[PDB]
């Protein structure tokens, strides 16, 4: 599978890229979607608003985006890094190992869902005025019967 960086209809496909020295850029439109798969050591930079972004089967890749109407998906991706310049409702991480998100004042409320993932860190610019503050995401759950009800809870 040789490099791919083509727009098919309203879907950007960026696949099969190895150790990329220079930043891979895409000038999208709000009606387009971005799919990134089978890549390693790559930094896709999505300029302009988009409808969606999906990072699939990647190793040490980083996505720099402005905003996304429906959010972003990350699946089977290790060593990933996401940086949000503006906003997006949610970022979903599944079966991924080691990831680092960087939200923005705008994107400070971005919901985050994780499933079967590890070493995920979310940094909000809430410190000394727009100064990142890491938040290691818990990967453990406790389940038990207590006080007449069998409740669940994240491990702290």
What tokens appear for 73 in the block?
């998906």
102 Cβ contact partners less than 8 Å away, ≥ 6 residues apart? 81, 82, 83, 84, 123, 132
User: For the chain, what are the domain ranges?
Assistant: 1-156
Beta carbons of 61 and 44 less than 8 angstroms apart: yes
Q: Using alpha carbons, list the distances in angstroms from residue 5 to 24, 34, 39, 56.
A: 9, 10, 12, 15
State the structure-solving technique.
X-ray
**Cα–Cα distance between 103 and 10 in angstroms, integer?**
26
List the structure tokens of 1.
Answer: 């599978």
Class of domain 1-156 as given by CATH: mainly beta
CB 95 within 8 A of CB 117: yes
- Tokens 């990831």 identify what position? 99
């Amino acid at each position: 599978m040789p490099p791919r960086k083509e727009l098919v209809g309203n879907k950007w496909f960026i696949e099969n890229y190895e150790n990329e020295t220079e930043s891979l850029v895409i000038d999208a439109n709000k009606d387009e979607s971005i799919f990134i798969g089978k890549c390693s050591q790559v930094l896709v930079q999505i300029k302009g608003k988009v409808n969606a972004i999906s990072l699939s089967e990647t190793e040490s890749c980083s996505v720099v985006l402005d905003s996304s109407i429906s959010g972003m998906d990350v699946i089977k991706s290790n060593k990933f890094g996401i940086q949000v310049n503006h906003s997006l409702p949610q970022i979903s991480i599944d079966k991924s190992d080691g990831g680092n998100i960087y939200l923005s004042k705008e994107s400070l409320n971005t919901e985050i869902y994780t499933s079967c993932s590890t070493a995920i860190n979310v940094n909000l610019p809430i410190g000394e005025d727009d100064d990142y503050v890491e938040f290691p995401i818990s990967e453990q759950m406790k389940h038990s019967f207590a006080d007449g009800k069998f409740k669940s809870a994240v491990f702290e």
